[PDB]
């Protein structure tokens, strides 16, 4: 049972973010395959258009325990490079998409993700809006990837839903702070560095497994193309004891 | 435990299809609420663009056992009317969306769906392509809605994934025939009438419950706006013994 992972692609040629989540399998004749689902979050101008901002699909990655480190290609012809995976399961890499949903010239983009140390993964993606009352809101969608024991159960490993987060001059919408969502969960996000990267912790008020879930770490980025006041973002929660 | 349902909205002002799936709850002070997730399938010109054709989100419907019959409004301001639900759980209705992803003037559109008689529901949406070799392929995405026992578990009730179907002069892509997908499942679809409606049966090769699933009925529509050779479509599988 190779672990689950998620990652965020911080696109450098548009204001969008993609999150990918899934699981590596050593099935076919010793070959490794990443089975993933993604959410592509587009930047919208107002919260009223939020409902149409999120696309969904799959990618199967093959090479160019089931190490993520290395170079991979997917079914759409995209390539990604993933470097060393640290002890906390953290990894960074670069992605070159072969295809785009926006009318911009493609640029190689960074990715940051985490693999489940020893278990499930959730990736969230959305946009940080300043509401009419000046409060920040995160409107997000997520994919919750469960571990399966054979590739034949991969089809049923991914749940989807939404979360709205609110914080516990309102010029730029910033991810830093302590947040609660509509399910009762809480997260804290640290400073967002110049590369748009941020770290935090997450305590979910709800579970889909019968394990004890502890406070779990999160790593993500915020998109900085055209330096928007309402940036898209993505993050991966690496569930602990899950 | 109010049952699960799914339905297909056959849009009349664009070449798209939306499927909705979810569950009615009598929570708040006797009030009924439909918790649903949807996939919006856009029409693309070639199979190479299929990957970006599908959007995802939620809607909560409230009124304008948990009967679907009646008039409902959702959180985006859309209205739908659902008429009588028959003994097989089949229903039809009309939908007026308040919002659009295409640059066309909005028109009231038919919907056709099914509620689970006594259990889960799957909705599929996709596009019927003629491949380069002239074979038909259905590229689809689905949401599998499970029944939960309280609204508090609604967040975890929906799985997402894909299926590719192939058939067991190639001018127009037609849904009629016997199909298999990449999981081993089989479906048969009857004639597609002038309104784009069709009926069929589905035998899944795989399950996410520990019940015995029998052959289960399906009802859907194909989109006929600009009479495309590669129409989008949606259908609901009303799982039996599930
Ligand atoms: O269009 C954009 O806004 C950015 C590029 C999005 C590329 C998507 S991510 C999901 C899918 N998988 C890929 O390898 N490329 C596309
Ligand atoms: O069940 C697991 O495997 C780990 C916990 C999953 C919690 C999910 S992630 C999406 C949703 N939003 C939350 O704040 N919690 C749940
Ligand atoms: O833009 C289109 O192609 C057709 C209209 C789509 C309307 C979508 S369906 C999901 C969401 N819920 C609604 O009530 N309206 C939008
Ligand atoms: O598990 C259930 O509750 C009923 C069966 C679900 C079968 C799913 S639907 C999507 C996927 N595609 C298939 O052909 N079968 C599975």
Curated annotation (Swiss-Prot), chains A, B:
Localization per Swiss-Prot or TrEMBL: Secreted
| Glycosylation sites noted in the Swiss-Prot or TrEMBL record | 79
GO cellular component entries:
extracellular region
Keywords linked to the UniProt accession? Biotin, Disulfide bond, Glycoprotein, Secreted, Signal
Domain named Avidin-like: residues: 65-168
- The residues listed in the UniProt record as binding biotin, with positions renumbered to this chain, are 95
State the Gene Ontology terms under molecular function: biotin binding
Q: What is this protein called?
A: Avidin
Q: Which organism is it from?
A: Gallus gallus (Chicken)
Q: What is the lineage of its organism?
A: Eukaryota, Metazoa, Chordata, Craniata, Vertebrata
Tell me what gene encodes this: AVD
Query: What stretch of the complete protein does the chain hold?
Result: 27 to 147 of 152
């Amino acid at each position: 049972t190779q672990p689950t992972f998620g990652f965020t692609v911080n696109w450098k040629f548009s204001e969008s973010t993609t999150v990918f989540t899934g699981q590596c399998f050593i099935d076919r004749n010793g070959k490794e395959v990443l089975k993933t689902m993604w959410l592509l979050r587009s930047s919208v101008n107002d919260i009223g258009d939020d409902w149409k901002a999120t696309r969904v699909g799959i990618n199967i990655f093959t090479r160019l325990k089931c190490s993520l480190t290395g170079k991979w290609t997917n079914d759409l012809g995209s390539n990604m490079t993933i470097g060393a995976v640290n002890s906390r399961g953290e990894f960074t890499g670069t992605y070159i998409t072969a295809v785009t949903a926006t009318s911009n010239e493609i640029k190689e983009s960074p990715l940051h993700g985490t693999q489940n140390t020893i278990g499930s993964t959730t990736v969230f993606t959305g946009q940080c809006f300043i509401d009419r009352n000046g409060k920040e809101v995160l409107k997000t969608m997520w994919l919750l990837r469960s571990s399966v024991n054979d590739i034949g159960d991969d089809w049923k490993a991914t749940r989807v839903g939404i979360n709205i987060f609110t914080r516990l001059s309102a010029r730029k919408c910033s991810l830093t702070g302590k947040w609660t969502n509509d399910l009762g969960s809480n997260m804290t996000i640290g400073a967002v560095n110049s590369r748009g990267e941020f770290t935090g912790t997450y305590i979910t008020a709800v579970t889909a497994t019968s394990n004890e879930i502890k406070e779990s770490p999160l790593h993500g980025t915020q998109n900085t193309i055209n330096k928007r006041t309402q940036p898209t973002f993505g993050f991966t929660v690496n569930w602990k004891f899950s």
